[PDB]
Amino acid sequence: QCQTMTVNRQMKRYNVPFLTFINKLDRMGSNPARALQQMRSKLNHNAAFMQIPMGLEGNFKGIVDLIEERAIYFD
Amino acid sequence: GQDGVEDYFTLYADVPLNDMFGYSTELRSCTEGKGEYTMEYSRYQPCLPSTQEDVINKYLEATGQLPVKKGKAKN
Amino acid sequence: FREVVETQEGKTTIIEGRITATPKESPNPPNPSGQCPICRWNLKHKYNYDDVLLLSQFIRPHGGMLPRKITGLCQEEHRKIEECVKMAHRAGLLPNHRPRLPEGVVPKSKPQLNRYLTRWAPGSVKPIYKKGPRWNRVRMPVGSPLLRDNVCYSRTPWKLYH
Amino acid sequence: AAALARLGLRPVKQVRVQFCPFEKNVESTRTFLQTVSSEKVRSTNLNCSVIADVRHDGSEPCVDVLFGDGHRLIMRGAHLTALEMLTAFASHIRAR
Amino acid sequence: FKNKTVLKKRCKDCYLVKRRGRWYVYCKTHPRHKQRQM
Amino acid sequence: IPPKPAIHPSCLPSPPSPPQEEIGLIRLLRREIAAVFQDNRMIAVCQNVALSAEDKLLMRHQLRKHKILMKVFPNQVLKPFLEDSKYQNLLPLFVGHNMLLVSEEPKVKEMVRILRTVPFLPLLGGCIDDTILSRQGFINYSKLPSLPLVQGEL
Amino acid sequence: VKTLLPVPSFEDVSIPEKPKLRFIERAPLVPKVRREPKNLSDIRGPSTEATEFTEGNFAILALGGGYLHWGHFEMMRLTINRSMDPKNMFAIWRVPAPFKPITRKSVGHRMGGGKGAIDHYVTPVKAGRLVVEMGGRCEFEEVQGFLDQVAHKLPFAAKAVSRGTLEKMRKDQEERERNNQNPWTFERIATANMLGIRKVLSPYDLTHKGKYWGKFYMPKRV
Amino acid sequence: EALAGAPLDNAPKEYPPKIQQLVQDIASLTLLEISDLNELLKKTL
Amino acid sequence: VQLTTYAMGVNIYKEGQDVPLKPDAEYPEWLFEMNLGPPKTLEELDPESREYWRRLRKQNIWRHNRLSKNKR
Amino acid sequence: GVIRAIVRAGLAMPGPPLGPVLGQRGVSINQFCKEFNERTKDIKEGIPLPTKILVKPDRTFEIKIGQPTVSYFLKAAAGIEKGARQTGKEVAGLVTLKHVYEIARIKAQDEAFALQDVPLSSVVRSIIGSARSLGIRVVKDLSSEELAAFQKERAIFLAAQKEADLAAQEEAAKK
RNA sequence: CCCAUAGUAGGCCUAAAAGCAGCCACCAAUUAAGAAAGCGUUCAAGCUCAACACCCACUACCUAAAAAAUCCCAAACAUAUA
Numbered sequence A: 001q002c003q004t005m006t007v008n009r010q011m012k013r014y015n016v017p018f019l020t021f022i023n024k025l026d027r028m029g030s031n032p033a034r035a036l037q038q039m040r041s042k043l044n045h046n047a048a049f050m051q052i053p054m055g056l057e058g059n060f061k062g063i064v065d066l067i068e069e070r071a072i073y074f075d
Numbered sequence B: 001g002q003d004g005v006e007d008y009f010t011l012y013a014d015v016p017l018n019d020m021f022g023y024s025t026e027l028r029s030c031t032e033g034k035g036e037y038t039m040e041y042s043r044y045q046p047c048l049p050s051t052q053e054d055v056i057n058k059y060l061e062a063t064g065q066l067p068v069k070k071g072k073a074k075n
Numbered sequence C: 001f002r003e004v005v006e007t008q009e010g011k012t013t014i015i016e017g018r019i020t021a022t023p024k025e026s027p028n029p030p031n032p033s034g035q036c037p038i039c040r041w042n043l044k045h046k047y048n049y050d051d052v053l054l055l056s057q058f059i060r061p062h063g064g065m066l067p068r069k070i071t072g073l074c075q076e077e078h079r080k081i082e083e084c085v086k087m088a089h090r091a092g093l094l095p096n097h098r099p100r101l102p103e104g105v106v107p108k109s110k111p112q113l114n115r116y117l118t119r120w121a122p123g124s125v126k127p128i129y130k131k132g133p134r135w136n137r138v139r140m141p142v143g144s145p146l147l148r149d150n151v152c153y154s155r156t157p158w159k160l161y162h
Numbered sequence D: 001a002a003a004l005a006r007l008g009l010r011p012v013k014q015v016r017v018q019f020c021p022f023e024k025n026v027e028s029t030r031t032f033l034q035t036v037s038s039e040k041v042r043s044t045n046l047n048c049s050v051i052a053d054v055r056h057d058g059s060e061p062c063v064d065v066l067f068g069d070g071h072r073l074i075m076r077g078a079h080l081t082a083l084e085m086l087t088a089f090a091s092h093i094r095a096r
Numbered sequence E: 001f002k003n004k005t006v007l008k009k010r011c012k013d014c015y016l017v018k019r020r021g022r023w024y025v026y027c028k029t030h031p032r033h034k035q036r037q038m
Numbered sequence F: 001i002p003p004k005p006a007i008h009p010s011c012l013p014s015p016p017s018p019p020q021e022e023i024g025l026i027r028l029l030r031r032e033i034a035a036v037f038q039d040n041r042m043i044a045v046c047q048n049v050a051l052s053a054e055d056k057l058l059m060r061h062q063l064r065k066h067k068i069l070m071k072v073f074p075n076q077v078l079k080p081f082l083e084d085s086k087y088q089n090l091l092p093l094f095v096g097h098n099m100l101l102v103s104e105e106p107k108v109k110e111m112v113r114i115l116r117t118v119p120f121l122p123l124l125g126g127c128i129d130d131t132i133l134s135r136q137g138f139i140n141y142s143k144l145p146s147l148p149l150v151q152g153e154l
Numbered sequence G: 001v002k003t004l005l006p007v008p009s010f011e012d013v014s015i016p017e018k019p020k021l022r023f024i025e026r027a028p029l030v031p032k033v034r035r036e037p038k039n040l041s042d043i044r045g046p047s048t049e050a051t052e053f054t055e056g057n058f059a060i061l062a063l064g065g066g067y068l069h070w071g072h073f074e075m076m077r078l079t080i081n082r083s084m085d086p087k088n089m090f091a092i093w094r095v096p097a098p099f100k101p102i103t104r105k106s107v108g109h110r111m112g113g114g115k116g117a118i119d120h121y122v123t124p125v126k127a128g129r130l131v132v133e134m135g136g137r138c139e140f141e142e143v144q145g146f147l148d149q150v151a152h153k154l155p156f157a158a159k160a161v162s163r164g165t166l167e168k169m170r171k172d173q174e175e176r177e178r179n180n181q182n183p184w185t186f187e188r189i190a191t192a193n194m195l196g197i198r199k200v201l202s203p204y205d206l207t208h209k210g211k212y213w214g215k216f217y218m219p220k221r222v
Numbered sequence H: 001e002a003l004a005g006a007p008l009d010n011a012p013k014e015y016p017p018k019i020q021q022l023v024q025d026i027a028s029l030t031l032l033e034i035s036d037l038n039e040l041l042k043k044t045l
Numbered sequence I: 001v002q003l004t005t006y007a008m009g010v011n012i013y014k015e016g017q018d019v020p021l022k023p024d025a026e027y028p029e030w031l032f033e034m035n036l037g038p039p040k041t042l043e044e045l046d047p048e049s050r051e052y053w054r055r056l057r058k059q060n061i062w063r064h065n066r067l068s069k070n071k072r
Numbered sequence J: 001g002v003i004r005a006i007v008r009a010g011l012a013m014p015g016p017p018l019g020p021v022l023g024q025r026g027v028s029i030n031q032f033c034k035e036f037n038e039r040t041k042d043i044k045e046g047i048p049l050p051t052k053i054l055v056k057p058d059r060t061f062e063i064k065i066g067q068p069t070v071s072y073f074l075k076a077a078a079g080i081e082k083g084a085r086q087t088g089k090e091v092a093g094l095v096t097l098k099h100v101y102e103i104a105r106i107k108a109q110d111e112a113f114a115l116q117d118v119p120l121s122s123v124v125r126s127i128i129g130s131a132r133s134l135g136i137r138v139v140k141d142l143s144s145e146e147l148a149a150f151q152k153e154r155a156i157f158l159a160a161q162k163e164a165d166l167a168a169q170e171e172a173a174k175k
Numbered sequence K: 001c002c003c004a005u006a007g008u009a010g011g012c013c014u015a016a017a018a019g020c021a022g023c024c025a026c027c028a029a030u031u032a033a034g035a036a037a038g039c040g041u042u043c044a045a046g047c048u049c050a051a052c053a054c055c056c057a058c059u060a061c062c063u064a065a066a067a068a069a070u071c072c073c074a075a076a077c078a079u080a081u082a
Ligand SMILES: [Mg+2]
Pocket: none
């Protein structure tokens, strides 16, 4: 949105590396692919993928790292 | 007039200061965040008769509020 | 006449168009100089709403009607048949001319209230509670305004508002 | 024939018409081909195409259509009009 | 709906209908043109 | 009290309507039709496609590049000319929207090869020097050899 | 194909100076010091003067009696000036300025003490009198439209007619009045005094022939 | 005088009679008339 | 500030020498048979020409446009 | 579909008209302007010409270069830079038949005339009608006649422009 | 019931008004369409209508109704002959 675009402009004009984290994944409106496509097209960033969900809305249980091929089962 | 760049445009406006009470709020609400504006002093122009009557009534209420208005509203 | 025939065989719908037979007019008209089917048989202002045979020759088996370019009626005669056919489906006449429906005739709500000379729809008119004073009383309409030029035998005009 | 354009014509694969010029019962298929090859109904999708086959000794105005579900619909307009086959094709392409 | 004695079409998509004893002017493009016969 | 007639006017046979006098537009149409039918020998009636004017001018420019023309006429002014003259066997081919081609000298190969690029441009046929033919007739006539060798083979 | 009729050429109708309507004032240039009574015979019956046309071909035909004050004239002239073409249309007033005085007393006063003071002024208008006349180089649809628009606003009944329309309406009126089935005409009974009807009628009905009553006009009385 | 019935070529069953008459007229001789035909054909072309 | 103002300084001879102007002999004769000032009416064209019917059609279109101004 | 746009050759800055429409369409604007500039650099005069573009569903635009307008050619042949507000009572200039004939024979190679069987009579009638609707006037072929016509028209048009500017200043002063 | 390309951003203060802010003339091409007949437009896009192409029902008797306080009031029948 607007504030995200302004913070992105500042961080890109002063060159600050960062990583994206997605929060609140326990509602009936989870879609990381749409947000990633927005970051690709609407902004001037690069594509990436580090975690895979196993169920949304009311089925969030854990995440994967897809770097060591070993998911995490939070308890 | 109106300018413009690659992504958006740049409007050249000419609005008096009397009609600048809550222009930022509606300008933002009608632009979805990514809209800004700058204001600077220009010149002077003749006043509209509605605002003329408004400022006349205001000066009358400030000086003596009992020539007709509140003089008849109370008696 | 013409009908449509659709058949299913091997996921291939075969929609055909077979033309069947149909009767024609009698080869002896009383008034061949007439321009309308009603006028050629001297039925000008001689029919009523009880004639189920005359009304069944200008309508559709599913309750519809036919235009003027197909039948042959004029402007004032086509409206009389259109009004008389509406007075028949409400009075229980023409039981075979009911509209097609899947399975909606399950809950029989209001019972078969017998009626005749019905001009307007039942479930639409408003009940008259005031009825006016006396001189300007609001009477209930009956009959049809286009059926006033018919032949009478009672030495009195057709009272449509009483 | 704007209903066919407002509905849609994407799942269809290939359609074609066959009739004879010298016959007197080929106006229905002719106006059907004219309406199906308009501007909106043709520009609403680019993954389909039509075939205009004209024969002399055909003696039959058959129109065979089929969509992406592997089905097949052939309608011979020997006695049917244009609106009938139009609404039939519309219902068949909307229901499936 | 608005009570109007003399009904008329305010644009193009307005179509006249006869329902429940009154003439109504329905419109899908401009819903502001809904009129009711009194 | 209005006068009540004994016979209603809608029941008696109405007198015939007076025939209107023919205007000059239809006269000029028939004249130019006869003109283009006497001088030109090759015509091809094809169903007019209800396409956009952009592709229409595109195909017009593609046709006229080979030194040919195009002109159509309404059926109301064409059916009498087709039923009173010698082309009495072409009246069932003008019952709807169609386009007539006026091209001087026989050049059926190039026009067929340039119209077959679109699979939505059918044609009912036409006459080739007082010889009525169809679409398949045209596509098998375009494969005939050159005129000089056919003239000299005898 | 369809025929193409030639459009009616407008070359014999030249627009004069001042195509818009003139200004109508309230009181005249000289006030009337003598108070006149409210003579009701100036609007009862058919009109005598200002009946036929003069310059234009379109005019509003009145079908009833009534009075028009300054506000009505102002509304009419404003509507004409705002709904016309100054380069193609022009109108000329047919009724004179209002001059009939009307005396009004004070609000909440006893009955007596003579007549009141003169306030406004009106003008008498009978039935069949042309209110305003407008011509130009236009046709018949638009002028009839914006003339009926004003005629519907008038107190009395009025319609927008022309020359051919007035001729046709007079022709059908005389056709209906000369082809009567029942042989009992109102004029024959009123003039010959049948069944002693002259006791409840009026001497003015001999010339009106039952076509007028007070100020209205029934065109279906025959 | 109108035109012909407009046949087709996909089903060879009928042929114009004038061609048959011309062929029957020109195909019933030896070689002198063939030489005369060649002479009258090469006179122009 | 941008504007297409390329008015060449033509006096009395710069309009025939700057461009390859051809004399009147090389130009065909049928190029001067066109109209000049006023256009063409209806009583100047014979009823056996397309121009008269086109003018009549244009007049009919103008009449229809002037008529359909108040109706909806 | 297609988008009608008439911009200047050597002056095609990304924004005015050709901006919001190109942004909402889904195609680029800077690349289009750069391509138009590199295509129009061949013109050594910067003549404004119309542009017919087409966009395909896969987001890709094409440019088809045609012939310029007629008003610019008429103003260049007459010599005046701005048109007049009246016709007949205030003529802007005079143009001989040779100039309009050359303009027609040069323009009769665009995508609108080369794809239609149109002769020279039709195009010269069209350009004569356009000149009459503009504010100028045509004439047979007047050598010395058009020379004297220009000699007097320079002065009368200078006087007309002076009086029009004076009237405009008066109307601007009455404010 | 269907149907719409182009000479152009026709001429001008306002930055421009490109078919709806004002002036006299309101041109002109193929069959056929108005330098604009009705909505949404600072300047452009979106929709119809008149005009071809196409069939071709009436394509329209013009407009003329209303709700106060104890509770609305006799009932009924369009069809055995003035
Ligand atoms: Mg447009």
